[PDB]
Assembly symmetry: none
Homo-oligomer: 77 residues x 7
């Protein structure tokens, strides 16, 4: 016997923004307080962690568009 696979996906797509101005943004936090008492840790595989954080962000992109996109073709006898 025989197999034939043809895989020809097309994408002419568009992701876009326009904006006149971003302007007055104020991020102004009064500071907190944290504590943790985690005695014994054992992390193995692909782990991510935070422990005891007190972190502030201000993220102001003039356009933060994103296009996440995956293909997979798999064949097994």
């Amino acid at each position: 016997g025989s197999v034939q696979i043809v895989y020809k996906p097309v994408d002419l797509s568009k992701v876009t923004s326009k904006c006149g101005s971003l302007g007055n943004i104020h991020h102004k936090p009064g500071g907190g307080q944290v504590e943790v008492k985690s005695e014994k840790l054992d992390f193995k595989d692909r782990v991510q962690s935070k422990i005891g954080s007190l972190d502030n962000i201000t993220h102001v992109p003039g356009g933060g568009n994103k296009k996440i996109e995956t293909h997979k073709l798999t064949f097994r006898e």
Copy 2:
């Protein structure tokens, strides 16, 4: 016998925004207080965690559009 697969998806799509201004934004938190007492940890596989966080964000994109998109073709004998 024989098999024939043809896979030709098309996308001419569009994701869009327009905006005149973003303007006056104020993020202004009075600070809290956290505690945790987690004695013994054991994380194994693909784990994500936070423990004891006190985190503030301000995220103001002039267009935050997004197009998440996956294909998969799988064949097994």
Copy 3:
């Protein structure tokens, strides 16, 4: 027998922004306080961590667009 795979995905896509100005941004945090008491650590494989952080960011790209994109073709006898 025999197998034939043809894989010819096309992408003419576009990710875009326009912006008139970003302008007045103020990030101004009053400082907190952290503590951690994690006695014994054992990290093995692909681990990421933070422990006891107090970190501030201000991230203001004049366009922060991104296009994440993966292909995979796998064949097994």
Copy 4:
């Protein structure tokens, strides 16, 4: 005519405490938020004020006894 005033108050009093221990005291407040918009002020005579306070106290005297005591003798022709 004539006047005679004699004024001889006596006090042998006592104010007292005993205590074995004061011990474990924890004062641990998560932080609030205040605002005031008082446009025009005019304070004249013997005034005390606070405006817009956010104040924490912890007052632990090993004996906080007090004896407030006033005399006044006044004579007018």
Copy 5:
């Protein structure tokens, strides 16, 4: 004519406490929020005020006894 005043009050009094221990005290408030909009103020004589307060106290005296005590003798022709 003539007047004779004799004023000889006596006090042998006592105010007292005994206590074995004060011990475990926890004062632990989650933080509120206040606002005031008082446009025009005019305080004159012996005034006390607070306006817009958010204040926490913890007052743990090992004996907080008190003896407030006033005399007054007044004579007028």
Copy 6:
């Protein structure tokens, strides 16, 4: 005529404390946030004020006793 005033108040009083220990005291506040918008001020005579405070205290005297005491004799023709 004639006047005779004699003024001989006596005080053998005592204010006292004993204490075994003061010990474990923890004062640990997560930080708040204040604002005030008081445009025009005019303070004249004997005034005290605070405006816009965010103040923490910890006051732990090993005996904080106090004896406030006033005399006044006044004579007018």
Copy 7:
């Protein structure tokens, strides 16, 4: 005529403390945030003020006793 004033107040008083130890005291504040917008000030006579404070204290006297005491004799023809 004639006047005779005799003024011989006596005080054999005592204010006292004993204490075994003061010991473990921890004052540990996460930091807040203040603002004030007071355009025009005019202070005249005996005024005290604070404006825009963010102040922490830790006051631990091994005995903080105090004896405040005033006399006044006044005579007017």
